[PDB]
Design a protein around this ligand. Sequence first.
Ligand SMILES: CC(=O)N1CCC[C@H](C(=O)N2CCN(C(=O)c3cc4cccc(-c5cccc6c5C=NC6=O)c4o3)CC2)C1
Length: 235
Amino acid sequence: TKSKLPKPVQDLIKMIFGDPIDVNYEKLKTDIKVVDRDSEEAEIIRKYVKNTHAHDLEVIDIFKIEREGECQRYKPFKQLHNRRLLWHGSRTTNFAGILSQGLRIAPPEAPVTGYMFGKGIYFADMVSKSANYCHTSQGDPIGLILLGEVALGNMYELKHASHISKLPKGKHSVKGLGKTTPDPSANISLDGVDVPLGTGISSGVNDTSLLYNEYIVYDIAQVNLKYLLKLKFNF
Ligand SMILES: CC(=O)N1CCC[C@H](C(=O)N2CCN(C(=O)c3cc4cccc(-c5cccc6c5C=NC6=O)c4o3)CC2)C1
């Protein structure tokens, strides 16, 4: 008459769904394990948060996640170059479907505006950018942000809104160039995956619409989710 899951994972599930805890965990088809806050993994992840602040974030919990057969789906793109661990932020309500059915692309038929690099899956190298999409208030100041291994390969680098139908030949992803970027010389390797956890600096990119680098992929197989973070927003 009890759940066998760790306490933080239980608090995480009650958060997502807003009926037995174990039954709702099974609905996700995702192995959610709590990263040790002392481990090298937690230290790098917690450093990526603090360095990419430009609304201050404390890392409550770090979960190591693995959605059913997302490995298999992504295997072709695990060969690609430029694999970066990047932020995706969404409303807490959406995380039931995300972990269930992964990150998806809205259809062209479905009306869409504010999208400035077409219908794909967007990501940030700065956490304060992805955090905005959590839409957390002082009333409920806990928000969820994903870390995903995005297989970007040859990036088609734009600095102005452009509705993308198809990528130029040889390009695998789009990268919007922002006014602010992580320090290129402070980039490290986590599992052969580039983690851009340098401090926010002036990119040098002048004539740009964007304040922050956005990364977009137009194939769901190019994404392989690694970590989910539970974040307290300090106002
Ligand atoms: C009914 C239903 O649930 N779904 C059918 C429709 C697709 C839903 C889904 O799976 N989605 C996941 C992928 N996604 C994005 O990636 C997306 C879009 C978009 C537009 C403007 C701006 C951004 C942005 C730009 C910088 C940074 C960040 C985002 C966002 N989170 C960020 O961290 C954006 O991202 C769309 C929604 C599932």
